Design an enzyme around this catalytic site. Structure first.
Site, PDB file in Angstrom:
ATOM      1  N   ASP A  79      31.738  51.141  32.624  1.00 35.33           N
ATOM      2  CA  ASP A  79      31.894  50.446  33.735  1.00 35.33           C
ATOM      3  C   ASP A  79      31.532  49.033  33.233  1.00 35.33           C
ATOM      4  OD1 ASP A  79      31.964  48.968  36.197  1.00 35.33           O
ATOM      5  OD2 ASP A  79      30.169  49.698  37.008  1.00 35.33           O
TER       6      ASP A  79
ATOM      7  N   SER B 258      43.474  34.491  34.168  1.00 33.82           N
ATOM      8  CA  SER B 258      44.859  34.768  33.983  1.00 33.82           C
ATOM      9  C   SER B 258      45.761  33.541  34.324  1.00 33.82           C
ATOM     10  CB  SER B 258      45.241  35.826  34.815  1.00 33.82           C
ATOM     11  OG  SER B 258      46.636  36.057  34.648  1.00 33.82           O
TER      12      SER B 258
END
Ligand code: 7B3
Ligand code: 7B3
Length: 330
Positions: A35, A199
């Site tokens: 994770d 992004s």
């Protein structure tokens, strides 16, 4: 040193991925959920409330000659989905894919919430976010990666998740056969303890690319792709019959649909998520309404590049002095 381990979807939907991990002496192998959005290595154990264990493999520290109680240490964690677990702490030897850390903090669960009990395939979590998020008190502990880093040939790990198929976590090296083209690296902020990046934009299907900054986290422990409501609405508007359902808890779409791809930007590069990766199947057994793999982050407080996005890429978690993320197509 290096390590290399195969990671396998837990079910036919890729809800999560499990990777075998050796703990203790003799080894006890547990299948953990790696994770990159948390920083605790915790396991089901011989200390876990018996009624909260239903099929998981447990770690038994009393059977490990290298286990030591970390005196006075406790831990307690709550995750973005509302699940939680807590307990006490041992140190022991932990190996992943041939890479060994001695003295790793292994957090033994005394209590787990119902969603953990109900998932018999996940024996615990192995956190790969920054150690500043580790919950052990009163002495915060380091992640497996943090402990291994100095011994690694290169201070990196890579995630190569499969779509309905196995994939690989590598530590200490970049497998240049595992991706196409070049790896595009992008800046990371560690201020919130996550692999947080920006992004450069998105496209829906064959549509034109929209240049827009989207700050979010690379999180292998989250199933879906969570993005701003504007972006998610633009995606689902391209799917006949798709709608946001407050009763179901997100965007749903007719199971008869063929979904468009979704592209996200990494610098000047582009990662394409095929439409099929966005299909999470019927909302309930036999339903013709299917759950979408792209959902709104509104009311989470952060955008999350979860498995839906990451499995479309070869992803480098670069833990050099200034961390960065790398993405390549594959
Ligand atoms: C069929 O899949 C689902 N159905 N209903 C809700 C869901 C939620 C919240 N997540 C993450 C999945 C994969 C879901
Ligand atoms: O319903 C659900 N709710 N939350 C997560 C889920 C994951 N899968 C597979 C289903 C059907 C889910």
């Amino acid at each position: 040193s290096t390590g290399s381990a195969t990671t396998t979807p837990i079910d036919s939907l890729d809800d999560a991925y499990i990777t075998p991990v050796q703990i203790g002496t003799p080894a006890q192998t547990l299948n953990l959920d790696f994770d990159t959005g948390s920083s605790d290595l915790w396991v089901f154990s011989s200390e876990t409330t018996a009624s909260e264990v239903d099929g998981q493999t447990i770690y038994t520290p009393s059977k490990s000659t290298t286990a030591k109680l970390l005196s006075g240490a406790t831990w307690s964690i709550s995750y973005g989905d509302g699940s939680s677990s807590s307990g006490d702490v041992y140190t022991d030897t932990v190996s992943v894919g041939g890479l060994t850390v001695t003295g790793q903090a292994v957090e033994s669960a005394k209590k787990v919430s119902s969603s953990f009990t109900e998932d018999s395939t996940i024996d615990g979590l192995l956190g790969l976010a920054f150690s500043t998020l580790n919950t052990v008190s009163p002495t915060q502990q380091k992640t497996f990666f943090d402990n291994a880093k100095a011994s690694l040939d290169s201070p990196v790990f890579t995630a190569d998740l499969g779509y309905h198929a196995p994939g690989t976590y590598n530590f200490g090296f970049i497998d240049t056969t595992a991706y196409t083209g070049s790896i595009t690296y992008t800046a990371v902020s560690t201020k919130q303890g996550f692999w947080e990046w920006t992004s450069t934009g998105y496209a829906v299907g064959s549509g034109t690319f929209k240049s827009t900054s989207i700050d979010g986290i690379a999180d292998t422990g989250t199933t879906l792709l969570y993005l701003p409501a504007t972006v998610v609405s633009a995606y689902w508007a391209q799917v006949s019959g798709a709608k946001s359902s407050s009763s179901v808890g997100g965007y749903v779409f007719p199971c008869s649909a063929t979904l468009p791809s979704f592209t996200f930007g990494v610098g000047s590069a582009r990662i394409v998520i095929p439409g099929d990766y966005i299909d999470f199947g019927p909302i309930s057994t036999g339903s013709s309404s299917c759950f979408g793999g792209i959902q709104s982050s509104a009311g989470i407080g952060i955008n999350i590049f979860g498995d839906v996005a990451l499995k479309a890429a070869f992803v480098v978690f670069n833990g050099a002095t200034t961390p960065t993320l790398g993405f390549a197509s594959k």
